[PDB]
Assembly symmetry: C3
Homo-oligomer: 611 residues x 3
């Protein structure tokens, strides 16, 4: 007790209910006066309770189906029949098999143009130029050449082959258009734009690895290094470890022994998106994202019979799925500086060399005339259908008594934009709207000329590439006269080098939407709010484990229900307003020089009759 | 496939198809004799015993719609270190989730100077200029002459002059939106209906943000998100970056040589993670935009607060704003201390000194340390450019609203109750005097006082940690070697004309935040009666958040975050256990510490979520 | 402006014209029936419509829980033994269980530095106690190739052969999962339920989402990554590259490909480090684990009535793995230095050790961690403590006697495991362990070498269900150096302009590359196809993705397959099963590209079956 506990557990009420029921049962002549669990549960909940209810008998089995449209190819329409098997059919997934493929043989391209104006030489293996400076005595030499990973110089016009890679998420872009046909008319359909909105919003981490494996995305692999820290020792030489100045203070910049024993982890990827000489056979199981994937919403076969039900997949072109990438061929850019102090200093004939410096980078380079194989075959494509069976007695009752089923459908509109601000009528909305995926994707993300299209195609922002360099630094000193003391002498030579150890590319996102406003039949559904309200807050607050806060900085969620993703309706936009629906945007990026696509994918409510 | 509905005892208990078919036979026979035209049963008839796993049924909801609304403060121009009060406008029939948009101006550090150079290291040949400090240690017994050089450079390596211009970078503390709200208060009629501090905001950060909400959560409160970056190919199948002379060697006995690299088997590239947001030091931190959610109970739509139930005269959201000195910090910019040690091994006359002849071996060691510029601090004039309260307003039909007010009676609510007790004891029993309602659970921690100290150069990071964090360096070192013959007429092998040179240069340095836990054991006692026996802190940090809560309870990353649980479903609305106070008068949390003493004071932080009731 | 009644669409989703009619009716009946208040009841509305704003809850039959820890009946615990706990009489019910295991801090015994490797070259062979040197002459090219191998510590100091050296120690991955060979819940001498480490690793792969992973790893003694940030690598408007190569343009004005430019952003790198039980250390700290017991009655709803399983005949029995499968030797602070030097001379005796005019020098240096001879694990490492923690649930006496007299029975889930060793590339394996309805089956074909003592990666591969090979990734430091040895002749184009270059291994990573052992799987029971022959990715990737929601995690292990037969794996409510008639003649058929007589594998099949438990 007391007051707080009477309202949370009501244990004095519960006991009085027990005393009352046991007496009424004794009054009425029951052999066993002890109450029923149901009688207790009419007011109180039983936290420990192993009760369950039997389910009407039901089992499921998957089935595989080849298409009606002959041998599968890229850039073609593939249609499946939905065979007659179970009383209902439910979740679907399509196995796509793409042949192992390599690029055709090419050549080592021509060397770059001269950099320096002096001492210009061009051979089959290098291009050399120089800049003189007689004032400072520094002679700068530029050398550029092609090498492989081992550093062996490659000859111009000799053999060289590009690698091949897939775009990111090839399973999502391959199905250009997925549609469910019932009696000629599309019952529901979606595009790759709806598939990547699912990719951003509806794949939590406990499903992410398999999702990636399902649609052909490579999965990172964690790799452990040697020990980098070992307690009570150091990799640094003794002369720089644990120094103190003349005052007894520990020296800033003097390393001390490690306090822990630790090793590094790093992640490597070597899948379909990593360029390879041969991309081995790619097997994807692309799920079809239809409402009836939920078992409860399985579609009765009698209400949509065989012969009038089809799955139709439009297949993208190979040029948007498979790309070339640099192979074992690199451009080595090397700068050498020779500071001389004697006669002819700053030129090739200068004497008295005191300081030498070398700077060397490596850039992966494409081979000339090495392209993807246009004969790569779609080796297999098959539709997997989950078929649900029930007893004849319950099927009869269910078909006569269910009436209808609520369904959800995709409604998509793409609007090419060159305005920094615009009010775009959403003319595709027939039905009540639960929520809307919004995006302003730059046209350059899907441009053939964009060398990073394999990556940018699904991003909803303008992406720029920022290099991050690993640099190896070296120093060397040498005495060239054994009779002169080195310290303070020009016989004590200096040498240094900066060599590129590796290079990363950081994708830097520039958002294309600043503010979004929603107006419908003269009614403000959303005031002009920053894009971060729809990308961060709304996916964070709503949806529970069914709505993921998107990684993409350009993915916006226009919510109109309380529980997006759940079957029970919880809010929508009335059809009257949906028929005059406007999305007003503000952009810092879109203009006449930067076209962008206002992508809006709505999820609408619709009914479906039975029997 | 054939369905088998009745196979023995197991199927009879799980599906009960014989009974289901008997119920159908009975129901169709009764309906037929009672005069119905359609004897087939209703779906409810079947649902009274059996569940239908295929079922498209749903219920219509009482008509409902919602719309957000911006609201500005009653307290004028917003500033750091101030109290900001919002009115809760009269708009919807109910109001639910709330979020505050905060806009912090772009800011830079003031102009400063390159500080003075470090003191001499060696006792010999001391020279100090405006650009370097040089000293040396002689050793004529070994013939090794050690030269110490320290100087200031930028990233490109150009030497910077002492007292020349230099400017520090600026950074925001980690999770600045969580620290910015010193206190958040929802008050009606002068008294706080519920309130919480930044300690509750970080308790939420550790226990209630799973990964499918994290990226958006980090963006809402100003924490930078890592960005994955891909490298060049590091392994290419059938080749190697190692030079031929060392690749694929065998010894004289035919065995492959240990340490001889072979060709790669796969073609792989590396992934690295980079950050460049509010927590990364920058010359100019761009304008910071945050949408801080208010972690109140009524964020749940089911618990939306009826507008007529609270007068408009005295209903407010009141937020105390942290000071700028706890949110924005200076950090080293494009300025680095270069520490170089050089050893020269000579063998002739004067060996070990600067005049020794015949140099046989040379070594160079060099590190770089980011350095603060003198007199370059944060801009104190940084403006809080905008702050606005977003309130979700829910609208219902007039009929349901009138029914709801007259029939709801009350609502069950959850509130925060905070207590912080300063400790210098390794073990103590702390009476929890702010705990006074049915408590579902208690967040517990023992945060060292140094984590929030202005003297801690890592306060921007340590402030929300509940442990003692020390910084262990990890070094990336570039090793180089070189040999050169200075006499073209003498064979190099075995001659002192075959010189030696080597170098170790710091490529990069990482900082490993090493947590030393402050709690060894925890005990929960109420009136000389154990609610929790003395268990290791790892029982409350790892096991309880692992077993309970489902997706509502996240196993905390912080090694010091503990969860004292008293219910079966910590995240759900339905009550499932509590400790009432009630006889909880003498509620004690007893701890043991291997860290807390007179030299390392800590704050025992205990935040409980309690059940209370609001009458509508 | 709410609408509520816009067309047929709003009629079927909200049914507001129907609800208004129900309210208007209910008010008139109550008015006609003489009620004081005619406004309807929330239950009256909810008979048709769902209320999205509803603070309703039900009171729970009073309950509370408390944990209790007990010691084994079998005295001091050791490796390779059976430990048995009694379940003490405490609460009305007992629920989740977790076992605290404490393993003493441990280190390897003292050993020696092993013998140096054999000669590589055929010429100029020298064997020291500190290095082994050989060479390969080449008079045609003028290249003298010198091979040197030695032993060093991390700092690089040379270690003498047969001098002192000690190995480090490491724990296998997921030690808490392998430590328990078998875990038994025993009643009346009969095993009521039991599982092995194989079931534990199946749970580790399929039922630990990311919001529970950190705590899960800490419970079973797996080290947790620690994120560490570096110095700024990019700084806006500057570069680490020296100016001679920065922002170059060719003679035509075009920017030079390969010429770096200033950075556009300012960024740090994030790397991850581990330093726990799996990282080799001179001394591993005292390992403390709280290993949960993965029985069905962990669910609070499914707590076991203390009366229904009497005291004195109920036990938890745990078989403990041998020490040699839990704790392993790993290389310590001893490294094999492999150095190749090439000397390009052109004068008399070129290509031999007597070459004169040295033009180019190259050094290639790798390091390989090396085991010390005679340094092994401490076989006297004690199990310092092991205790079983049991949650005890207390309920009111009135509800206790009612529930025990009325619940009848409870559904339980039990493990049923079979391991079939295979050398056949394809086989059809009868599952004799299956006797009861099966919800789903964890499947794998684990290579026998993953648990073989001869495998030096057994500490890692034991829980993997594929064949793992080790692919090195090398971080290589490249350096160049040029020096003029004659100050009277111009360096350019002269043999006095000497060249030197070095490649030194900076670090090396091991990539675990998984080779799948299962190609296709087919499920055939009672001559009936429940699963056709489908690729292994259907069971590994598609099924865990589609089913189970947050209760079924997609497995990272490429060899983990999930054969599902219910709609909702992870829920207590039954949702489908394989019936007993078919379960008694049950076949799992596989095809393999890996398994043959040179690579024996174990087909591991662990099914979750449904059984029942009577009450008392």
């Amino acid at each position: 007790d007391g007051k707080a506990d009477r309202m949370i557990m009501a244990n004095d009420l519960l006991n009085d209910r027990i005393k009352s029921i046991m007496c009424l049962r004794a009054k009425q002549g029951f052999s066993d006066p002890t109450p029923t669990l149901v009688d207790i549960e009419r007011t109180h909940i039983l936290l420990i309770n192993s009760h369950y209810k039997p389910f009407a008998a039901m089992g499921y089995e998957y089935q595989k189906t080849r298409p009606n449209t002959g041998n599968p190819t890229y850039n073609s329409t593939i249609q499946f029949s939905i065979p007659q098997f179970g009383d209902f059919f439910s979740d679907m997934v399509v196995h796509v098999q793409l042949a192992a493929t390599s690029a055709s043989a090419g050549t080592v391209p021509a060397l770059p143009a001269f950099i320096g104006a002096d001492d210009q030489v061009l051979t089959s293996t290098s291009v050399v130029s120089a800049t003189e400076n007689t004032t400072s005595g520094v002679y700068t030499l530029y050398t550029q050449s092609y090498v492989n990973q081992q550093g062996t110089t490659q000859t111009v016009a000799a053999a060289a082959t590009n690698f091949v890679r897939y775009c990111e998420y090839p399973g999502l872009r391959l199905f250009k258009r997925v549609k469910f046909e019932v009696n000629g008319n599309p019952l529901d359909e979606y595009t790759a734009l709806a598939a990547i909105m699912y990719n951003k919003f509806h794949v939590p981490d406990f499903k992410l690895t398999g999702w990636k494996r399902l649609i052909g995305q490579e999965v990172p692999v964690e790799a452990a290094s040697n020990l980098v820290n070992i307690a009570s020792t150091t990799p640094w030489g003794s002369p720089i470890v644990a120094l103190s100045d003349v005052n007894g203070t520990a020296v800033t910049g003097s390393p001390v022994n490690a306090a822990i024993t630790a090793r590094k982890l790093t992640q490597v990827v070597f899948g379909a998106q990593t360029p390879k000489a041969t991309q081995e056979q790619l097997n994807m199981f692309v799920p079809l994202l239809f409402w009836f994937r939920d078992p409860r919403l399985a579609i009765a076969s009698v209400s949509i019979p065989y012969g009038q039900r089809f799955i139709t997949v439009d297949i993208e072109q190979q040029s948007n799925i498979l790309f070339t990438a640099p192979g074992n061929l690199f451009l080595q850019t090397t700068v050498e500086t020779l500071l001389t102090t004697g006669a002819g200093k700053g030129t090739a004939t200068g004497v008295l060399l005191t300081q030498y410096n070398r700077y060397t980078t490596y850039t992966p380079t494409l081979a000339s005339g090495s392209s993807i194989d246009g004969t790569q075959a779609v080796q297999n494509i098959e539709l997997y259908i989950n078929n649900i069976f029930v007893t004849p007695e319950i099927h009869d009752i269910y078909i006569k008594r269910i009436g209808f089923t609520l369904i959800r459908v995709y409604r998509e509109q793409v609007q090419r934009e060159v305005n920094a601000a615009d009010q775009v009528l959403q003319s595709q909305l027939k039905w009540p709207v639960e929520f809307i995926y919004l995006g302003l994707r730059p046209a350059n993300n899907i441009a053939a000329g964009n060398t990073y299209q394999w990556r940018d195609w699904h991003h909803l922002t303008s992406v720029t590439n920022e290099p991050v360099y690993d640099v190896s630094q070296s120093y060397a000193r040498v005495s060239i006269d054994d009779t002169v003391a080195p310290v303070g002498s020009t016989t004590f030579k200096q040498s240094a080098s900066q060599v590129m150890q590796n290079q990363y590319i950081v994708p830097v996102e520039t958002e294309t939407l600043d503010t979004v406003r929603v107006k419908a039949h003269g009614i403000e559904l959303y005031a002009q709010y920053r894009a971060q309200f729809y990308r961060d807050y709304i996916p964070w607050n709503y949806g529970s484990f069914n709505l993921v806060t998107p990684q993409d900085k350009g993915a916006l969620f226009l919510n109109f229900c309380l529980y997006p993703g759940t079957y029970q309706p919880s809010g929508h936009v009335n059809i009257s307003r949906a028929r005059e629906f406007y999305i007003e945007y503000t952009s810092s990026f879109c203009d006449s020089s930067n076209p962008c696509d206002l992508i809006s994918i709505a999820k609408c409510i619709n009914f479906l009759l039975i029997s």
